[PDB]
C-alpha cells in the first residue's frame, strides 16, 4: 500500500520538513553548502554563519525510516527549503545513510531533478512546485511544531481527531529562527514537550505518537 | 583509530577503500555514523534534558565509554570523528 | 540539564605533544627533552668506548 499524494482519500501522516537548508554551488564541479566543510565561502557569500546545515534534514531521515508507521506505509515526507523548493520523497526510498552519500545525492537538486530506480518504474525524489495544501489530503489538520505553543500529548491529539483523513505537521528543520506560521497553512501551533527540542526528536516524538495512536 | 603517514582518523566505511581490508576486517563493520546518530537522538530526547538518562557505550573492541548527560555532542559527523579520536587516545574529554 | 561544549583539539595527534599557546614554555620543554636525550646518549657512548 504505497502512498503518493494522488490518493487524497486515505488516512496519512504528512511530515513537512520546512525551511530546510540544502543549497547547491558551482566550484567544473558541484558542491552543496555545509557549515563544516567551508566557512570562507559563507563569508564571501555574506550568508549567516550558522544556517547552512543540511545535517538537520539528513538527521530527519529518521522519520522517513521510522519503521512502525513507514513499514505500515501510512507516512509521507515533503521538504520545503528556504529556497522555496518542494521535494517529495517516496515512502519506500532507502535514503543514503552517510552524509557524504547524501552530499552526492545533489543530482536531484541540480542535474536529474527526478530520480528513477535501477529498474526505473516508480519515482523516488521529486522537485514539485508549491503549495503543500493542494498535495495534501482533502481534510487535513493544521499543525506546526513550535515551542511556546501549548503542549499536548500527540497520542491524545491524534486520537481525538476521529477521521480527519490525515495529520500534517510542519516541522522547521532550521538551526535558529522562526517558521512560517501565518504565512501558508497553519493557524494553530501545537507545541511538543517542555524543552526546546531539535527537529529530529520533534519528528520522532510525533511519529511515535502516531504509532501508539494508530496501533503501530 | 588509525595512522596515516602524520594523521589519525576514525575508521569509516568511506574514508578508505581498503584500510579495513589491510587490517583484516570488512568494511561493512566500520560504521561510527550510527552510534553518532544514536548518541544525538538520546541526548536530544526530552528524558535526557529532564535528567533521567545516562548513555554508556561499548566498542566492539571492548572499550567502555561513559557519556555524561551534560555533553553537547557535535552535530556534523567529522567533528564527532575528531572528538572520538581524542577520546580514544586521551581517555578523557573536558568541557 | 545544563549543556557544556567539549574542549578538544582538531587534527589530534598523540605522538606530537599538545600545542601550548606559549612559545617560551613549550620551547623550554622541547629543549629540556632534547638535552635529556642528547646528554643521555652522549655519556652512554663515552662510557662504553671507555669500556
Amino acid at each position: 500500500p504505497v502512498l503518493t499524494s494522488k490518493d487524497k482519500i486515505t488516512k496519512r501522516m504528512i511530515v513537512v520538513l520546512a525551511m530546510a537548508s540544502l543549497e547547491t554551488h558551482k566550484i567544473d564541479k558541484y558542491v552543496l553548502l555545509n557549515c563544516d566543510d567551508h566557512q570562507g565561502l559563507l563569508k564571501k557569500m555574506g550568508r549567516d554563519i550558522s544556517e547552512a546545515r543540511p545535517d538537520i534534514t539528513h538527521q530527519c531521515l529518521l522519520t522517513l525510516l521510522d519503521s512502525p508507521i513507514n513499514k505500515a506505509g501510512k507516512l509521507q515526507v515533503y521538504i520545503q527549503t528556504s529556497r522555496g523548493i518542494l521535494i517529495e520523497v517516496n515512502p519506500t526510498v532507502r535514503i543514503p545513510r552517510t552524509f557524504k552519500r547524501f552530499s552526492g545525492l545533489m543530482v536531484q537538486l541540480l542535474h536529474k531533478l527526478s530520480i528513477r530506480s535501477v529498474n526505473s518504474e516508480e519515482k523516488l525524489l521529486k522537485v514539485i512546485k508549491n503549495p503543500i495544501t493542494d498535495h495534501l489530503p482533502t481534510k487535513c489538520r493544521k499543525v506546526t511544531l513550535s515551542f511556546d505553543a501549548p503542549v499536548i500529548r500527540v497520542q491524545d491529539y491524534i486520537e481525538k481527531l476521529d477521521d480527519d483523513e490525515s495529520i500534517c505537521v510542519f516541522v522547521g528543520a532550521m538551526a535558529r529562527g522562526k517558521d512560517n506560521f501565518a504565512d501558508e497553512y497553519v493557524d494553530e501551533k501545537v507545541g511538543l514537550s517542555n524543552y526546546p527540542l531539535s527537529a529530529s526528536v520533534a519528528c520522532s516524538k510525533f511519529c511515535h505518537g502516531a504509532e501508539d495512536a494508530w496501533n503501530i | 583509530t588509525h595512522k596515516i603517514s602524520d594523521k589519525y582518523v576514525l575508521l569509516n566505511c568511506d574514508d578508505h577503500q581498503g584500510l579495513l581490508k589491510k587490517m583484516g576486517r570488512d568494511i561493512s563493520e566500520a560504521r561510527p555514523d550510527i552510534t553518532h546518530q544514536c548518541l544525538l537522538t538520546l541526548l536530544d530526547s526530552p528524558i535526557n534534558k529532564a535528567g533521567k538518562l545516562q548513555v554508556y557505550i561499548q566498542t566492539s573492541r571492548g572499550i567502555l565509554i561513559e557519556v555524561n548527560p551534560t555533553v553537547r555532542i557535535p552535530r556534523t559527523f567529522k567533528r564527532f570523528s575528531g572528538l572520538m579520536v581524542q577520546l580514544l587516545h586521551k581517555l578523557s574529554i573536558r568541557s | 540539564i545544563p549543556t557544556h561544549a567539549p574542549k578538544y583539539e582538531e587534527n589530534f595527534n598523540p605522538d606530537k605533544k599538545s600545542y601550548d599557546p606559549d612559545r617560551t614554555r613549550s620551547e623550554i620543554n622541547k629543549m629540556k627533552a632534547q638535552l635529556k636525550k642528547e646528554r643521555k646518549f652522549t655519556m652512554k657512548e663515552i662510557r662504553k668506548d671507555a669500556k
Binding site: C35, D36, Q39, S50, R53, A175, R176, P196, L197, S198, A199 | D44, R72, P74, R75, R79 | P2, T3, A5, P6, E10, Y19
Partner: peptide, 19 residues
C-alpha cells in the same frame, strides 16, 4: 545553553597564524 544551535567552530592554527 545550546538549544540545537550546535557547538561553535574553533579556528584553525594557520588561520589564527595569519594575523
Amino acid at each position: 545553553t545550546d538549544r540545537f544551535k550546535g557547538d561553535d567552530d574553533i579556528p584553525y592554527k594557520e588561520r589564527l597564524f595569519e594575523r
